[model samples]
Target: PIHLFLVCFPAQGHINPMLRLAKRLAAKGLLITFSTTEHAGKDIRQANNIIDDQLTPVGNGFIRFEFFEDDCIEDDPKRRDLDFYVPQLELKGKEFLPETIKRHEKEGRPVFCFVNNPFIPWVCDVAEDLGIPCATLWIQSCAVFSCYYHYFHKTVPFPSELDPSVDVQLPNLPLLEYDEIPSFLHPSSPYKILGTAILGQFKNLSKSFCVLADTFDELEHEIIEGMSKFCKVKTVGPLFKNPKKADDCLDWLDSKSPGSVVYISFGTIAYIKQEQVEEIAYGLLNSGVSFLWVMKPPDVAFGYDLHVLPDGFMEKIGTRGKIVQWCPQEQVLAHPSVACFLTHCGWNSTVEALTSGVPVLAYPQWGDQVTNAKFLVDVYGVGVRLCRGEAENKVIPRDVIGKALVEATVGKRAVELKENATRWKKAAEEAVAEGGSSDRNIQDFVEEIRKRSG
Candidate 1:
């Protein structure tokens, strides 16, 4: 049995993908030890508990699990972005590798490799010292990866020679402006520490034995091919561990007619102003579309006291709407009841929507979500971008939200995107099969680890 050790940055966006990737490796005959911070493992179990009754110690017959304390020593009070997770992850990783190899050394299936969602600078040294193989799994688009890769080269006078203030145009994405990148990139922004650290480590990423991209070849083949010129690049995605059975979301779908409900979830951290929330409420009310909205409550992002909804928001809509703090998203998308997705375009969400055949109304506001929006708009053909969210100083208003919803959910444009999404879904399934690119990537991934692990 091939054993793979996996760890994720402490966030749902990254954790969710790590779980799926580990599980997928297991299905490919790799034994996986999926690790997370205890804090994260609690949240995942809490989230997973809500959906399925089966709680096997080992999931899907391939992966076992592990938990580690977050070793992030310094928290940049200035920036709480997931990027802040780097130092601790690096610290934790440095210590984790050697210890893990010994702990499992006597086991029947000794550890064969490490597959990280991101490059922990510390781990590279460990792998090099231990003479073991490791792979870096890039969750962001290749285009975004290229931006950071280019940043790794310039000898900065200090922190940045590449101005964070000026809108830097990403390669291949010509029409997008620098201002269009995530809010974290603004020159004077607080999150620069995390951004700068990751940027500093950019060129070092290729040092890994292989790279795992969280996108299909059909979606970002150019970037994929470009990056592969340097390392073993694999298109191994739509890699979400959607529950195989017993999703209660199907009942919600049956409750709504086919292609009728619009599903909205902006990731765990994407925030919206009070006014913007109101605008979305108004838009949903005006567009007269049935919808399901997931509201994660770590922040007051889309706060409504139930009464703030438009008059008759529930009654008038009459079985047309449901508001949830969170939902089994993969299940919701896989169901036929969902028509379109109003998303922040987090990589995982975008892929799920694409793989599930749901068209997207890309509403990305920050992080890799911006890069994802472009992919959806220009490359994937399964989505339309909402310019309302990008307007400077603009509070998303109800009219803007409503109009865009209508365009994405009903109009001829929406229909075309929906059809495209359907095609992308088929492509994803094909990509994961016997002769699929995804399957080939897995083989390369396993082989790379084998050579490096010895």
Candidate 2:
């Protein structure tokens, strides 16, 4: 069997995209080994009913999971930080991956190529040293990628708060404000670990054989074009399994009126402050719109009780709302009762909401999310932004959150946003269907790999 080695950052955002892509590749008759850190990998395995890392098959037995243990470097409290943990992961991965790939080779199933997250670009050098081609799976909007491309090339100057009056421009792209661009690009920004890693990732892309993004051509036609100027960029996205309706979320949604429930979730990476959770609870209750909210508890060894939400919040909402620790997000979005998505604008959630023909009320948090919120409000016109401050961590008032939900769901603007969302949803579906650009691109990529392997 032709084997593909897939590596990802041990985060839900990164793993979800890679998992979808792995299933797609596996369906093409290739064997896939999806790898990440021990904790995340084991959680996935347990969730999927796999007992251990013994090549236990999944996705109809086409994909297998492998995990890497954090040796001596495991207990750093700051290890939760992606930037701090990534270099440590690579140090471990460099030793583990080469040996793992060699083990496959000895079994007469040599790894055909390595696919990895853009944040961990050193994996490509490892692949190169081991005589395997590599591809970078960039899990961000194409517009954000284009912005980084120009910033890395010095084709455009980084915007600053000092020049709040100015806007940055890139070739064949929309004009961006200082606030819309990722904060990491600023000279004085504090997220140096993540910022420096992305910079190195940009340089490393030139060394890789291919680059793939979790986006489609129609969504960002011009911005995707800008990407090809730097490398052979391929778009194969909206790449998720069909939503599984066999969940309690769907059962609850079935009881709500069509296009009446506001589905709210922030993606997993960022922690929502206790103050913010109170606002969300208060806002949802005030809206009086039936809602399903997935509130992620703080990461800890001992699980927080379900009652961590604000005082009197749950009893007051009563039957009008359903709160869960977690639910199948795609399933919730695809439900006909889910009219609007109040999101943190994470790329995965953005695509899922848009593809499901659900309108958005953008509550952007960080990273490319700020730019994604701009795309939703300005470019896509399929959503409205909330009253968020320059510092995204600030608490958004329940009044505005409730007000925005009412407007996005029942106001006249809702009609236009809903129409736009429906139009884009069809376009995204067509892009992945037979004879479409995204479908054609992936086929070409697969065939190219097949020929190389043969």
On TM-score, the leading prediction is 2
Q: How far in Å is the alpha carbon of 118 misplaced in model 1?
A: 2.4
Worst 10 residues of 1 by lDDT: 152-161
**What overall lDDT goes with each candidate model?**
0.69, 0.79
Minimum summed lDDT over a 10-residue window in model 2 is located at: 298-307
Off by over 4 Å in 1: 42-61, 70-85, 106-109, 154-175, 241-249, 299-308, 388-391, 452-454
Identify the candidate with maximal lDDT: 2
Candidate 1 structure quality by residue, lDDT tens digits, 1-454:
7777776666666787777787777776667877766666667666654222232344434666676766433443422444556665666667766887777876566767766655355655566676666677777766777656644553221123374335454445544555455444446445566576556445466557777877777777777777665556677886773323544456777888888889989887666655666678778877888889876665433353432555566676666778777688888888788888989888778878888899988887766677678778887888877752443556766776777788887778988988899899888877776767777787777777666555
Clashes of each: 7, 0
Error of 1 at 440 (Å): 1.6
* TM-score of each prediction: 0.84, 0.90
lDDT of model 2, residue 355: 84
